[PDB]
Amino acid sequence: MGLAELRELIEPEETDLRALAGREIAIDAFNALYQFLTTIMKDGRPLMDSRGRITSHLNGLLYRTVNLVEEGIKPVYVFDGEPPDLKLDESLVEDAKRLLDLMGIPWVQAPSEGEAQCAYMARCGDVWATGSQDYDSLLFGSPRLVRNITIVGKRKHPHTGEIIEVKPEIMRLEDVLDQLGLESREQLVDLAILLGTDYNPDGVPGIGPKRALQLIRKYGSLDELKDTDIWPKIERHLPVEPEKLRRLFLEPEVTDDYELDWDEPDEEGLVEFLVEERDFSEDRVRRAVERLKEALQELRKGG
Ligand SMILES: [Cl-]
Ligand SMILES: [Cl-]
């Protein structure tokens, strides 16, 4: 799974949404849509319009984005481009972009990895953090990652009926390094390569997470593990040469070509799209548009 395996060591800062009031967050769009598609359901299936087309993605993107802006959070959604060679239905993606345009919520087309683009925007100081369920943006150098941003809330377990609560949680790159006893992001990347990433998802069986971490700490780097006895097992399992894997995380393809704005929603266009084409409740959509205008306004009047 990757860095997620060292969750006991990482331990984020558990917070609430109102603590992120005023923060711009670069949310990985593919990750967000996946959460919406897999968790917003009716009788065990995704929400659908009267023609049978999926709507869970539009539902989440509209109503949860409005909720975030009501807590003072300014989201920007960032979409995957072409993945690197080692690495969602396109209609869902175009639905998403159309919706955000109508809502006035900014988005960016990444040239390759969305999570890398999010991290770059955070490094440049154009957003405060990245927002995803994945830990990838840290490896791409994001100074801050907020997890659970698209799924904050409470539910009952179908089985136990207990109140499961999901809260937003913050991880700061600098603290993650300290928590793991590492010196640099470069070592974090080397560690992640041992554990397995999207570019090498098997990791290195035979090396558990604690062992991986100990190795990186003791020997310093993946490069320096060449002179050791464990190397052949590593070289066997790494699909490509290690430096090319490192380069993907340390020098990801990203773009400068964006300018972040939060515009007024287009009430009538939203109604045409969601209500008339996708069978959303008109009263609910219209009310969401009013809630959104007011929330944007409340952020404007303090700067
Ligand atoms: Cl709602
Ligand atoms: Cl609805």
16 is annotated as contributing to ligand binding? no
Give the distance (Å) from ligand 1 centre to CA of residue 197.
35
Angle at 33 between CA 166 and CA 303, to 5 degrees: 75
Q: How far is the C-alpha of 150 from the C-alpha of 27, rounded, in Å?
A: 9
Bridge partners of 267?
none
How many residues does the structure list for the chain?
303
Chain centroid, CA 142 distance in Å: 11
266 is annotated as contributing to ligand binding? no
43 is annotated as contributing to ligand binding? no
8 is annotated as contributing to ligand binding? no
Angle at 28 between CA 191 and CA 190, to 5 degrees: 10
134 is annotated as contributing to ligand binding? yes
The data reach a resolution, in angstroms, of 2.2
Q: How far is the C-alpha of 290 from the C-alpha of 216, rounded, in Å?
A: 52
CA-to-CA separations, 222 to 96, 140, 226, 253, 293, in angstroms, rounded: 40, 17, 7, 22, 51
Chain centroid, CA 278 distance in Å: 26
Q: How far is the C-alpha of 175 from the C-alpha of 188, rounded, in Å?
A: 12
**What residues does each domain of the chain span?**
1-303
Neighbours of 168 (CB within 10 A): 25
For 74, the 3-state DSSP assignment is: strand
**Which listed ligand is nearest to 281 at the C-alpha?**
2
Helix (H) or strand (E) holding 147: strand 144-147
- In eight-state DSSP terms, residue 296 is H
Q: How far is the C-alpha of 303 from the C-alpha of 297, rounded, in Å?
A: 10
Q: Which of 132, 13, 38, 17 is nearest to 76 (CA)?
A: 132
Neighbours of 230 (CB within 10 A): 15
Neighbours of 140 (CB within 10 A): 25
Please name the amino acid found at residue 128: W
Give the distance (Å) from ligand 2 centre to CA of residue 36.
14
Q: Which of 271, 274, 283, 263 is nearest to 69 (CA)?
A: 263
